[PDB]
Design a protein around this motif. Structure first.
Motif, PDB file in Angstrom:
ATOM      1  N   UNK A 120      -9.639  -2.711  13.102  1.00  0.00           N
ATOM      2  CA  UNK A 120      -8.815  -1.714  12.431  1.00  0.00           C
ATOM      3  C   UNK A 120      -8.644  -2.066  10.966  1.00  0.00           C
ATOM      4  N   UNK A 121      -8.462  -3.349  10.675  1.00  0.00           N
ATOM      5  CA  UNK A 121      -8.326  -3.736   9.280  1.00  0.00           C
ATOM      6  C   UNK A 121      -9.664  -3.728   8.560  1.00  0.00           C
ATOM      7  N   UNK A 122     -10.761  -3.963   9.271  1.00  0.00           N
ATOM      8  CA  UNK A 122     -12.070  -3.768   8.658  1.00  0.00           C
ATOM      9  C   UNK A 122     -12.277  -2.300   8.300  1.00  0.00           C
ATOM     10  N   UNK A 123     -11.757  -1.400   9.134  1.00  0.00           N
ATOM     11  CA  UNK A 123     -11.847   0.027   8.853  1.00  0.00           C
ATOM     12  C   UNK A 123     -10.946   0.419   7.694  1.00  0.00           C
ATOM     13  N   UNK A 124      -9.807  -0.254   7.551  1.00  0.00           N
ATOM     14  CA  UNK A 124      -8.977  -0.049   6.366  1.00  0.00           C
ATOM     15  C   UNK A 124      -9.643  -0.677   5.150  1.00  0.00           C
ATOM     16  N   UNK A 182     -12.756   4.903   5.969  1.00  0.00           N
ATOM     17  CA  UNK A 182     -13.666   6.021   6.176  1.00  0.00           C
ATOM     18  C   UNK A 182     -12.927   7.278   6.621  1.00  0.00           C
ATOM     19  N   UNK A 183     -13.351   7.855   7.741  1.00  0.00           N
ATOM     20  CA  UNK A 183     -12.909   9.188   8.124  1.00  0.00           C
ATOM     21  C   UNK A 183     -11.468   9.191   8.610  1.00  0.00           C
ATOM     22  N   UNK A 184     -11.032  10.364   9.075  1.00  0.00           N
ATOM     23  CA  UNK A 184      -9.782  10.454   9.822  1.00  0.00           C
ATOM     24  C   UNK A 184     -10.010  10.144  11.296  1.00  0.00           C
ATOM     25  N   UNK A 185     -11.249  10.291  11.764  1.00  0.00           N
ATOM     26  CA  UNK A 185     -11.565   9.830  13.108  1.00  0.00           C
ATOM     27  C   UNK A 185     -11.536   8.311  13.149  1.00  0.00           C
ATOM     28  N   UNK A 239      -9.655   6.323  16.046  1.00  0.00           N
ATOM     29  CA  UNK A 239      -9.973   5.016  16.606  1.00  0.00           C
ATOM     30  C   UNK A 239      -8.813   4.048  16.432  1.00  0.00           C
ATOM     31  N   UNK A 240      -8.558   3.619  15.199  1.00  0.00           N
ATOM     32  CA  UNK A 240      -7.516   2.648  14.899  1.00  0.00           C
ATOM     33  C   UNK A 240      -6.184   2.963  15.566  1.00  0.00           C
TER      34      UNK A 240
END
Ligand SMILES: [Zn+2]
Lengths: 100, 72, 207, 187, 186
Positions: free
Chosen positions: D17-21, D25-28, D32-33
């Motif tokens: 989740x923090x890698x995604x932050x 990227x998207x709202x999807x 996920x997160x």
RNA sequence: GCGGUAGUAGCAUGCUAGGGAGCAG
RNA sequence: UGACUGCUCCCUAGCAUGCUACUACCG
């Protein structure tokens, strides 16, 4: 039902053990003795009622002296109270009206 | 004056009993005798005579070192 | 009722327990095995074992809570202080026990006079004190039993007063309970003679 | 509380989740997160929420059985003491005159308040005052229970010794008075 | 109490959401500025009551330890508390009887047996020097405990009963002083 | 949207046990 | 050396219940 003024006074003044003596340690006696010495307040004769009020002022003195006393050698003391219920009669009165 | 007398007799008898005056039998019997004769006394001269008598029991020893103890 | 009368006439060195030398693990003791009351006649035990190789715990108990061993092993005693029929003695020096006086609580006293109490003439006045007692007070107080005499009571009216008293006690109810429902407040109060050398009622309520 | 099983799932999912932050990227990505996190926390919902009551139960029962082992040693101590008291207090039973006075009874049963009165080998008599002292334990011998007793020592309240010379009428009121006479059984 | 990090986080949350509700904006910011506040307010107003419990517990445990220390002294100094309480009570009490015998016992005239009270039985005394003696001692009377004991003997240390008439201030420097000047009640 | 249930605090009530003290027969 | 029994206050601990909000997840 009231007791016998001499009885309550006597039990105030004469204790067994030198620990009963010092009062600050045992503020828990004077509360009970005052619970038993309450119905004297409604009495007609005078010096009776003064027994009760003596007991209340005595608890007050005991406390508000212990608190500061322990404040000094400390460097703080009592901050949250409602011990103030111990020295006014509306606590001791609950125990003679029918509800509990 | 009265109630002062009763209470001082009480502390008196106790201070004796700390000196082992309870281990001479008839000594301790006379003491106990006085100290209950006071506590029931209705006048206030009988109290003083029994008192001075009781006190004599204490002075006659060497423990309760008076001179200093009365430093005033 | 009758026995209470017909039992003054007989001697008083023949009431109390009985005994009989029993042999445990080939060693002899003395143990009570009955009683002789002034009223209920003679009463014999029912579970006496003339031998035993080992006593358990319940046994050890009911043999160390008995007079028979202590008395039957002790120096005779004649007590000229009382009238009550003495029996035996255990120590070699009798013990004289006394009672001390109270303690004064001064600060309450000065604070009490400040408010103007104990003015000579008042209506409240010290009266309840801690009285002292000398040496032989214990026994000169025990002695007071000599106010207790054998009494025959009338009977054809005791057997009616007992109906009516029972009628009073009628709304209630009771029975034997088991050893897991009893309730015992304050579990550190003494256990009486032979046991109070070892601990308070707690220890014998555990083991 | 820091080393449970599902802890690893939580660690990977929220590090992700923090890698995604970190990418953002998207709202999807938020979908996920926000389903991963909540499900991974729905894990610890149970792990560090149940085993923490298990440890309560464990250490609790353990301490109870500790207390029980204590009580059970106390039983042994009391038994040993009671037993040795009996087997030291019997040895003075005087097993002779007794042996006689039993083996004569109708059957073993002989009221207790005579075993000392006929077999004991020492008297101890307590006297209040002199005037009664005379009418019993006078002199060096008296008789009581019809055996012949002989004085041999006298004490008093404070437990000391007086010689039988001193107990007159004049020297009386200096005697801690409940004199306690300790005789013996003379034949 | 603002010395906990939780207070810092809640401060910034309150701050930003206040700024945004003031300046005004869309709903998304303030829903983010509610799931960015209420979580902080949580992680605050839990520990900031846990700690207000802790500190109170602390104060009480310290007062209890104080009670215990005070006791385990006060039941170890009776031997002098009793005595000094006694003599202050006597001085307050005050009586020629008392005050008299007390002064004397401060000096020498310390009895050997209970001061009787009958008008018959005797008493004893332990004079030392000629002075205290002469102040009390006179002829055939020995005034004491506010009473008139009349002499019936007089002795010395190893008990060579001397007379009385011998004793003055110069001749008396020749007698085992510690008398035991017996007497009887007036 | 409304409810679901689950963890987290907060309050009250009650019951339990252990502790200190007071009174009555 | 410290008996049985009853009522009462005060301080901790635990359980239950409710009250409670904030988060959740599902429909
Ligand atoms: Zn039954």
């Amino acid at each position: 039902p009231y007791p016998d003024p001499s009885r309550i006074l006597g039990a105030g003044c004469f204790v067994d053990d030198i620990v009963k003596t010092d009062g600050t340690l045992m503020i828990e006696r004077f509360v009970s003795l005052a619970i038993d010495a309450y119905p004297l307040t409604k009495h007609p004769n005078q010096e009776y009622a003064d027994v009760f009020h003596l007991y209340l002022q005595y608890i007050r003195k005991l406390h508000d002296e212990l608190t500061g006393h322990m404040l000094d050698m400390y460097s703080v003391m009592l901050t949250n109270d409602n011990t103030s219920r111990y020295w006014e009669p509306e606590f001791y009165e609950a125990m003679y009206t029918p509800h509990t | 004056k009265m109630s002062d007398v009763k209470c001082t007799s009480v502390v008196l008898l106790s201070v004796l009993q700390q000196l082992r005056v309870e281990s001479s039998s008839k000594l301790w019997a006379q003491c106990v005798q006085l100290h209950n004769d006071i506590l029931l006394a209705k006048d206030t001269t009988e109290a003083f005579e029994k008192m001075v008598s009781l006190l004599s029991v204490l002075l006659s020893m060497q423990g309760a070192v008076d001179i200093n103890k009365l430093c005033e | 009722n009758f026995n209470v009368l017909f039992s003054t006439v007989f001697p008083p060195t023949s009431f109390g327990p009985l005994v009989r030398k029993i042999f445990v693990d080939g060693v002899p003791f003395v143990v009570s095995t009955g009683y002789h009351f002034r009223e209920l006649g003679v009463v014999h035990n029912q579970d006496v074992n003339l031998h035993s190789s080992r006593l358990s715990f319940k046994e050890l108990l009911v043999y160390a809570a008995d007079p028979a061993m202590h008395a039957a092993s002790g120096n005779l005693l004649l007590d000229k202080r009382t009238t009550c029929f003495s029996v035996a003695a255990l120590t070699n020096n009798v013990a004289f026990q006394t009672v001390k006086p109270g303690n004064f609580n001064k600060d309450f006293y000065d604070f009490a006079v400040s408010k103007g109490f104990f003015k000579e003439g008042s209506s409240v006045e010290l009266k309840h004190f801690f009285f002292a007692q000398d040496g032989n007070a214990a026994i000169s107080d025990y002695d007071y039993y000599r106010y207790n005499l054998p009494t025959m009571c009338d009977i054809r009216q005791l057997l009616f007063v007992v109906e009516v008293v029972d009628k009073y006690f009628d709304c209630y109810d009771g029975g034997c309970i088991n050893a897991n429902q009893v309730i015992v407040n304050n579990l550190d109060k003494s256990a009486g003679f032979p046991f109070n050398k070892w601990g308070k009622a707690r220890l014998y309520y555990d083991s | 509380f820091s080393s449970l099983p599902s802890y690893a799932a939580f660690a990977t999912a929220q590090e992700a989740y923090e890698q995604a932050v970190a990418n953002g990227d998207s709202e999807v990505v938020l979908k996920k997160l926000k389903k991963s996190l909540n499900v991974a926390k729905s894990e610890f919902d149970r792990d560090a929420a149940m085993q923490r009551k298990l440890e309560k139960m464990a250490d609790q029962a353990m301490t109870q059985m500790y207390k029980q082992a204590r009580s059970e040693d106390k039983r042994a101590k009391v038994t040993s003491a009671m037993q040795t008291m009996l087997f030291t207090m019997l040895r003075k039973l005087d097993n002779d005159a007794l042996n006689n006075i039993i083996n004569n009874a109708r059957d073993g049963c002989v009221p207790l308040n005579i075993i000392p009165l006929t077999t004991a080998a020492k008297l101890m008599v307590v006297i209040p005052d002199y005037n009664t002292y005379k009418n019993t334990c006078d002199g060096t011998t008296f008789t009581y229970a019809s055996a012949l007793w002989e004085i041999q020592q006298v004490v008093d309240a404070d437990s000391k010794i007086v010689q039988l010379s001193e107990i007159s009428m004049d020297n009386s009121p200096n005697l801690a008075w409940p004199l306690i006479v300790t005789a013996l059984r003379a034949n």
